[PDB]
Design a protein around this ligand. Structure first.
Ligand SMILES: [Cl-]
Ligand SMILES: [Cl-]
Ligand SMILES: [Cl-]
Ligand SMILES: [Cl-]
Ligand SMILES: [Cl-]
Ligand SMILES: [Mn+2]
Ligand SMILES: [Mn+2]
Ligand SMILES: [Mn+2]
Ligand SMILES: [Mn+2]
Ligand SMILES: [Mn+2]
Ligand SMILES: [Mn+2]
Ligand SMILES: [Mn+2]
Ligand SMILES: [Mn+2]
Ligand SMILES: [Mn+2]
Ligand SMILES: [Mn+2]
Lengths: 375, 375, 375, 375, 375
């Protein structure tokens, strides 16, 4: 049907030409809760509203501070590789965190002591590459599609192996390696970035031994192999520097919310939250203090954000599971639950605040249930 | 059908959950021209992706620098009023320009010499209110829906008459007017902002005479009553400070592009362009120098932007007329046409640049045709 | 009498209308030391020159970067609560440090693991609440008046429990707790902030047990129960992260200077100093390098500041004890004493600098005496 | 010989490896005047210390805010073209001012009304291109070497005709001009920037007539054909918006100072001065207030700067004429002469300031002599 | 001879007056590698292009962000002291690192616990003074010349002992020490900064004992007494916080490159590199990503810079050893070698990137050789 911005005796029909498909995606923005108030920055952006860079072997598109200006500290790329296709050997200033949504890939990294790590990553697995350490990605037989998160919102360029070489004098490259200019005459004249290639062999045949030893901590993590926090309406899997040891600047949670359930009312006492919606449909109200609150809708492909310590919840508003990531630029994950907070205070003190009685304080739980199901 | 980000042997199918409706709206973003290159800021945002403020009497939603960070100098509100409904008497730091898309409204303004101007505005008419001059809007019998543009991208609050009074000591208000506190006890305790009211009478019965004379220049302009620049594929109506005399800080063009036509390749030598798409479907490539270019799609409800002097065109990609506004924070409208530029140079000099011959330079026109039709 | 800005043959009588009471408070500003020189930022502001927010149950007033722009990293609130009155359950981005000047209060805090801490605080006691951890204050039978310091100078709003709830959809609150909308219909429609309430019972009856254990470190500290550094002219009590373990971002000293005594010539090698004058009258010269120095006067109710590493002293210029706080945004307190510095160098090297002899270097002490008494 | 940083009993021999050739170029920096004092920003940079971009047809090198950070508002390019060589048709945000040091060139410009201007420029002639108006340069039979000044210090890229076309979809270019894609298949795939070409014919055969009329004001100026201000030690030729009418944002003076002469003590009351040293050797002291002053040396190829209203002089310290440009981002040239200032005051008032008598005030001149010769 | 900016069929002779001596110093800037491309900030500045502050006892000159704006985090002073001459007792906000290029000096430092450290430093030795800790330098019988590096690029003033005292009221100084105003009447009226003095006695006779114990870590380091990393073409000596324990904010390497050798292709994965060229002649290309690269020349007296993670090499282009320092604002030194990186990957994966075969991958070394010699 044709939604209208009308809530009781407020609002009016739209009389100008309009985008009905977007209005249908944003029911809580066309018709917000009457409890929303005040100016709040935009906290929502879709990867579908970005330019897609197409290459022989896949694609990449990005959501940065140039698209979502509230997110100054975190930026993201949605990258797709065809079977065997390679994301060229490269490095950058930013640390990189990744979640494998579809397929599988082989990654390489070499550290500043010349120690190498090569591993395969499947659906639900993570990687984290510390700032400036060079790495590559190669999709295996299914291809691969993954979300990358960088710990600077201004992320724009990366340093590519073949770009460096194409911009270094040939006589210097030749001197660097002890070869003649003729022996390196076939070097590419420009970057590859993403390129097609044959499927690699078995992981065990790729492992490179060297004089400098094994890396002290792995750069990949099997998130979905861990035991989640399970509550009535869903599951939360947390990876931060306490369990995924190398992941110093990114803390993460994968949240699944069943139909009829919600990520409970909470905030993060440490830093801003950046969100990616893998599947399903949500709404979230962000409470910004001083009587300011604004509700946003999200679905698969959307990036969201919750500035440091703002109150929020994430409600599944669809008939399928809602699956999303909560990402923090910090060495740990932390939340304060509204329910648990109030449960741990004297009941008459809580009653004095809320103008409610024992029938309310009796429902509070001292145990944290990150995802709750509607009764 | 199901679009895919594939262009020849580049790109791949989407393997993750996705937003198919948005992908269908953005065909030149999911599959950009092969001529696009490099990092370019986002130049596109939809009013449908904003929170709608609903009141008794209408609604308002906004696109500001908090949504579209490239647009630091210009922000916009889409406001709707029901019949008789009033946008409360108010003022702000920003100058305000307006285009009436639907219906009609009565406006009031009083200047710094105490001179008043009251007028009715219909579809295709403009207003402009200089910074800090207080004004109101009241929809007539059809109601009204209009686009407001403010000459600061950070636009967020306005000063409302009843809010000022509600935050002034009652004894001061009473002293200001020579009345008792009892005589003003019924003042509202909070702002109205938008409120329902009876239809006003005839314009002529509202005109207020005073000791200070007539305003020197009218604050409204009948844009669509002017003679447009007519070219093969469409029409352009320009209002800037040379014709709409009070409009010192906003220059504007309403452009109509027939199906199969395009706003020609051009740039603006004076300042940034802010766009609103009233109806139809477009694509535009923004050329940013140094080999950077990015293509965007637009449709009804979208805001666009073209930073100062960047090369661009606007192509109708639908079967209905494309109608949009070009807005500039300047005292005049100016463009340089690629066609006219090259037509006014020696033909062999142009040939030396383009590696093309007389058969090309023969097609160039010394006359500017802002909108061209495909052959 | 009537002070005049005259120092020997410099200065002149004031010939315009003037503020004689303020001139009397600022004798070293109306008539500075002849050793002052150059442009130095303002380092002084009075709480009496701020707006006082009055509520049922007390008041609060603040000195922020909007009042004292040199203090970009630290801001402060002077808050007063009547007996039993409650500062509403709330949180904020900033860490909070506090000094109880008058009376006593009960505080609550619940951490990110759901562990609670409830304690009573009396005169001379501190609290510290880490960023984002929710807390409350309730005055006991004497009421309470305390100084709060926040580790951001831009401090302006806090997140209040009842404000969050008033801006969350009722259906979401009901879903969050497993109750009906009817059971929460009496929730307040706006924040309380400060509110009157009955005196609480004994502390031991308020302690809440829970499944998550005791907090690892207490959030309160009995500063005046510690052994001070005692020197001839006064006492210094230091609390930083080395003794008050949770106090990671605020280091503090309470200094008492007897009449005729002075906080010695020193600087802080770690960070800026923020000052609050609890009682008495002072002057301080701030030495800013490159021959710049400016003298300021302070008395009860004043905030002062000393930018990172600037040389200074604090002289009691009255007949009662001078009592003030030195606050640092750091994990430790550190000072370098001019006396001790020179005492620890070879005497002829010091003599070569100062153009003075053994009779001077003989007075230097290798032991640090933070507060010295005039002979 | 080997200069040393020694001035009387101050300074010492250099004991580390050093750059003797640069020390010889900077005698007043290795051994400054004893009257210099305090921290002053760098006001000097050489084009020889910049990367030279070499192309088929010439070269270009630049001094921007990235080289000389004091100069935030003005940047410069030294460009050289071989005979017939073309600086490709282009535009940019910045206004452009130029001085032809060597040879001659033909310029084209087309304005926003489609009016064209084509002219030849020889040694000592200027051009000025308003922001965003497209233009080209083509060297004639001698080739050409010129200094360009842009009215933004951040100047980095320009919009090139063939770059725009190479980044526009071929179907759009074809639609724009009413030609087929096949007819434009030979368009260059990348920019030309600077390219070789045959010498053009006579100027009169290039003039393009059109329907839109003559430009109202010429874009070139014959500076050295004007009557200079002639004083005892040299000559000054001024071009600003009062005589070179289009030159709205750049005011300029070409100064020649004979051996033994100096540009007198003066300042500019309007804005910052940017300098280019065409030939000879200079020193200048910049007086920055508050007892700060620093002396710099300049020679051919150097850029200098004098921030707004700072006191200065320019002394010829060589045996050939010193020739330099003074450039201002303003609509006029203005200076205050120290001599003329004091000459226009009562002599006893001047004597009271300087502690000198009639024998000094008797030498002052009420007439301004910008360049004075040593007696 | 007379160099010209000509590379094959690109470039042209210089036709304007020019700086031939600087052009001869910058052969790779007048004629860059054809592989250079795009806008890159200036990464080079000479101490010879700075004002030299001359005093009785020596000199000091500086390169700060005001000279080299890319270097926002690090600034440097070249200071020279005559025999016995003293750099006055002082402190500052910035941490200070030093390298003794010529001669020897005695340093003093007293920490925040009143512990003193006095030591002699010779050629090749370092010091590091933590922020705000007061210190002095006194040259011994050879005099001294050293490079100081400060961990803020805005470095401008320091706090001097005698300046502090000259700007403190005499009555306060007298009260601080328990002396009369008459006993301190001979204090200097202004700073000394650098001053002549008799040679000190033996180090052992200067050591000051005190009640507070020995400093836990020494403030000097004998860099050239350590075992260097020795490779075919040179030597690298590293001092960071892992070996020079107090040096928390500065990591450093002294690199020696024999004629015909080069510091290999590498980057730093942690932070920006600041360079000082002690002796010899170099070129370096900085690779900035996205196809941007620019080559710079350096010789004795030059400061260089390499922004975080940019690719680079340093080639000796002279007939003597090239000796330079690499400085980082970090707690450790780290590099990634291009050679070692590729050696630690599967050979066919490397071949797939570079379009080269086994004859290339066979030359790669798993061991890092920071300095390589040409074959
Ligand atoms: Cl990437
Ligand atoms: Cl409005
Ligand atoms: Cl508060
Ligand atoms: Cl150019
Ligand atoms: Cl120094
Ligand atoms: Mn990466
Ligand atoms: Mn969350
Ligand atoms: Mn308005
Ligand atoms: Mn346009
Ligand atoms: Mn608080
Ligand atoms: Mn202090
Ligand atoms: Mn140009
Ligand atoms: Mn001048
Ligand atoms: Mn120092
Ligand atoms: Mn390096």
């Amino acid at each position: 049907d044709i939604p209208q911005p009308i809530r009781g005796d407020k609002g009016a029909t739209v009389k100008i030409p309009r985008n009905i498909e977007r209005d249908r995606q944003n029911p809580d923005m066309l018709v917000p809760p009457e409890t929303d108030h005040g100016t709040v920055s935009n906290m929502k952006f879709s990867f579908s509203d970005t330019h897609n860079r197409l290459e022989k072997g896949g694609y990449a598109r990005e959501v940065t501070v140039r698209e979502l200006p509230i997110s100054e500290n975190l930026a993201s790329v949605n990258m797709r590789l065809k079977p065997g296709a390679i994301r060229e050997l490269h490095w950058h200033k930013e640390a990189e965190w990744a979640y494998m949504i579809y397929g599988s890939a082989r990654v390489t990294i070499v550290d500043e002591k010349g120690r190498s790590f090569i591993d395969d990553v499947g659906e639900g697995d993570l990687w984290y590459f510390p700032s400036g350490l060079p790495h590559s990605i190669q999709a295996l037989e299914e291809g691969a599609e993954f979300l990358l998160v960088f710990d600077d919102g201004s992320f724009s360029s990366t340093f590519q192996l073949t770009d460096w070489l194409a911009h270094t004098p040939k006589e210097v490259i030749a001197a660097n390696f002890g070869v003649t200019k003729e022996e390196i005459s076939n070097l590419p004249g420009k970057e590859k970035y993403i390129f097609e290639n044959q499927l690699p062999g078995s992981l065990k045949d790729d492992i490179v031994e060297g004089p400098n030893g094994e890396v002290p901590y792995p750069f990949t993590y099997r998130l979905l192999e861990q035991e989640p926090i399970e509550s009535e309406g869903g599951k939360v899997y947390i990876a931060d520097s306490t369990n995924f040891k190398v992941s110093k600047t990114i803390a993460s949670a994968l949240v699944t919310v069943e139909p009829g359930a919600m990520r409970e009312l909470h905030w993060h006492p440490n830093t801003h939250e950046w969100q990616y919606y893998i599947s399903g449909k949500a709404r979230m109200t962000v409470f910004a203090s001083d009587g300011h609150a604004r509700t946003f809708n999200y679905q698969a492909g959307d990036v969201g954000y919750v500035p440091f310590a703002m109150g929020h919840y994430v409600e599944n508003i669809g008939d399928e599971p809602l699956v999303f990531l909560e990402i923090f630029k910090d060495d740990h994950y932390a939340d304060v639950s509204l329910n648990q907070w109030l449960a741990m205070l004297p009941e008459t003190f809580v009653q004095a605040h809320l103008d409610l009685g024992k029938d309310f304080t009796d429902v509070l739980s001292k145990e944290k249930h990150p995802v709750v199901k509607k009764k």
